[PDB]
């Protein structure tokens with residue numbers, strides 16, 4: 001037997017490592033793999049087809065004992081594959097369906113986003129926008145869902161033009177600001193589902209001569225080191241990336257070694273850190 | 283050599299209504315079932331009053347025989363949790379804990395979701411008025427199951443009276459006096475959600491006693507799939523929470539805590555399932 005664990009990204013390891021979420025999740029993954037003498041393995045394919053092939057060779061090689069998926073996408077072929085080959089794997093993120101069958105690690109993203117939206121609403125904001133990554137990712141749907149419900153519960157409208165999907169990058173944050181700040185009735189607060197987008201939102205808002213947070217409040221997610229040092233420092237939700245990783249690996253090795261298993265879900269705590277990007281609105 | 287190997291279950295009062303609730307046998311089933319895999323025996327507290335129980339825990343730790351502790355129930359302002367945390371003693375908790383969720387390891391159902399799910403079901407049947415009977419209010423599970431439903435309705439735009447809301451103690455008797463109370467006002471809801479199978483049973487029987495035909499007159503859903511649930515009348519609408527697995531997953535968690543010095547606090551979430559036999 002060989003103990004190595006496979007890691008699967010949502011895209012090229014090169015795109016992934018530009019996002020500080022990933023080195024931190026891997027850092028948690030590794031910290032545990034160490035405890036049980038497991039090593040790590042990832043494929044290099046950039047393309048979706050290439051990433052599939054990647055996972056397939058992993059399973060075909062009989063050298064990988066288990067696989068951690070660092071993401072959760074709707075209709076992931078990767079999951080259809082692993083489920084059919086009966087290969088041991090674990091999610092970081094809610095699965096679209098079969099919660100009962102799949103073992104996953106996640107934050108309560110629905111509630112984190114609800115809480116962020118409650119936070120802004122208690123601040124008197126009534127025109128609140130959401131900027132996320134892919135629609136097809138479940139962390140995005142959930143984060144959307146929680147802020148959305150929070151708005152409907154306080155009787156606050158959420159127009160289609162305040163909901164944005166882009167990839168997670170700074171540029172995304174800049175195009176969002178173009179779109180949002182370009183409307184006839186723009187938002188006064190903004191929730192970004194990723195610090196990269198937060199950081200970009202900030203620069204873009206500042207290139208246009210706005211001031212955060214007097215003109216626009218921003219909350220974002222993930223606590224990137226960069227968020228601490230942004231000017232002004234970003235309110236963000238710490239989502240405990242490392243523990244997501246550590247706990248994912250601990251769940252997988254258990255699944256692999258025990259080999260008779262029950263599927264559970266593991267919820268790692270989040271924390272809203274209010275730094276400097278939010279101001280009162282009343 | 284060198285092995286002791288046993289876990290401590292902080293039991294409810296022997297004279298409490300909770301001891302007799304089916305939730306506990308089933309949770310102990312899970313606990314013993316996993317405990318057996320690692321060869322842990324179970325030791326249980328016998329106290330009746332809150333002080334006696336507290337003493338028991340102090341005895342458990344002090345004796346140094348017992349590896350870790352499971353708290354079967356969740357009390358507010360909790361003293362035992364405080365003492366345990368201070369003694370650096372590994373413990374796990376069935377149910378959400380009001381405070382320090384971040385600092386404790388616990389095992390739960392997504393009760394808020396389940397309640398929402400239940401509500402959306404009834405609406406789909408499309409019931410204008412829905413009422414709620416809960417075990418008394420402080421326990422979180424009640425608060426969450428309340429919130430879940432109260433939200434789905436609000437989203438729905440259905441309205442909750444504050445008379446559709448009740449709160450009395452997890453007893454078959456409790457579910458009796460509620461049916462008498464609820465059919466008491468000018469409007470009868472025609473749907474109900476109860477947070478406990480005992481309550482659900484006294485709800486089915488108190489409206490047999492009044493000449494109301496379930497499901498066609500009044501529709502009922504209740505939690506926990508006691509499986510007293512199957513027996514009762516027409517079989518129910520129930521949310522089955524796999525209590526066995528709560529117990530099992532709680533033990534797995536503690537044994538890990540006991541053996542590997544695992545600090546990290548996480549919530550472990552057991553899947554639920556809305557069966558519908560009304």
Ligand SMILES: OC[C@H]1O[C@H](O[C@H]2[C@H](O)[C@@H](O)[C@@H](O)O[C@@H]2CO)[C@H](O)[C@@H](O)[C@@H]1O
Pocket residue numbers: 019021070071072092093094105106107109133138139168193194221222239244
């Ligand atoms: O909340 C847990 C969450 O972690 C990961 O989500 C990442 C995402 O993949 C990254 O690209 C970046 O955008 O930040 C997210 C963290 O907030 C898992 O991919 C996701 O499935 C899971 O929900």
Ligand SMILES: OC[C@H]1O[C@H](O[C@H]2[C@H](O)[C@@H](O)[C@@H](O)O[C@@H]2CO)[C@H](O)[C@@H](O)[C@@H]1O
Pocket residue numbers: 300303305355356376377378389390391392393417421422423452477478505506523528
């Ligand atoms: O959802 C799991 C829920 O379980 C417990 O709640 C019990 C309660 O203790 C019983 O007396 C009765 O109300 O059945 C409930 C479960 O349906 C705990 O509160 C905790 O495990 C958790 O929140």
